[PDB]
Amino acid sequence: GIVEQCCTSICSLYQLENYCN
Amino acid sequence: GIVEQCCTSICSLYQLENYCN
Amino acid sequence: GIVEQCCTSICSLYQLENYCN
Amino acid sequence: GIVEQCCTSICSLYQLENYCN
Amino acid sequence: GIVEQCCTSICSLYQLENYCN
Amino acid sequence: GIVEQCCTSICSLYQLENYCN
Amino acid sequence: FVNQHLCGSHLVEALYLVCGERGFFYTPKT
Amino acid sequence: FVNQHLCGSHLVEALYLVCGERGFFYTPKT
Amino acid sequence: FVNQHLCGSHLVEALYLVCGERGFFYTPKT
Amino acid sequence: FVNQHLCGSHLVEALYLVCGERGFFYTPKT
Amino acid sequence: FVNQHLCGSHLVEALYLVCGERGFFYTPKT
Amino acid sequence: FVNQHLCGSHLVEALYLVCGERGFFYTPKT
Ligand SMILES: [Cl-]
Ligand SMILES: [Cl-]
Ligand SMILES: [Zn+2]
Ligand SMILES: [Zn+2]
């Protein structure tokens, strides 16, 4: 999931935005 | 909520555990 | 400058991009 | 010691508590 | 102490070295 | 440069000082 | 342990510490 | 914006800045 | 995304996030 | 609470949150 | 270098930076 | 002062503390 993706690969701010409430 | 309990007021680390999943 | 825009006032992440090289 | 343990392995908050004054 | 010197007042990085072991 | 040096090797605060405006 | 004021990014850093793999919700609107 | 490499508490900081008053949920594997 | 107050080290942390490899200038005098 | 993996300045942040007004001492090897 | 206000977790982060392997004490009661 | 091992946002924090009101520029490779 996002926590692993951002650390083992890369992630965008747009992907992070999906985890806002 | 959490801001009122922990920022505006003060909270313990045990109170912070209230917001774990 | 940046402090006035983002600290004193409020700014968006797009405004912060104004200070990228 | 604790600085190395927490970084090379894991450590608990209860172990950290021992380093408070 | 350190809070009075560096938070309440202002301190230099050399003053901060006063609290090294 | 400094960003890579500080991460792949080590760097001093005196070297960092060179990047102040 | 202690009780203290935790605000902003410091609050979520503390939640990360306390919750870890459990995960957590930060919901300031309440 | 640029892509990100974020581990540990750095991910939680990024979520805090992206979501603001909306807040967020932090849900690691396992 | 949102608008918020970003001050001190938090401001430069946000600039790092937003700019990344582009780099950035932090110039408080203006 | 959960167990922790803390390096560098992250350990010092955790000590700060655990100890509060009592403060702490940070004593690495060598 | 400069003189500035350093408070809370930011103060201990600065002590970590300045002291490093020497280690340090943070003792707010004095 | 001691020598430093600084990656990611930790370098930017160190620059912030070293430069204070003067500010700084952050310029990675590529
Ligand atoms: Cl890190
Ligand atoms: Cl602050
Ligand atoms: Zn802060
Ligand atoms: Zn880090």
UniProtKB/Swiss-Prot annotation, chains A, B, C, D, E, F:
Disulfide bonds join 6-11. This is Insulin A chain. It comes from Homo sapiens (Human). The gene is INS.
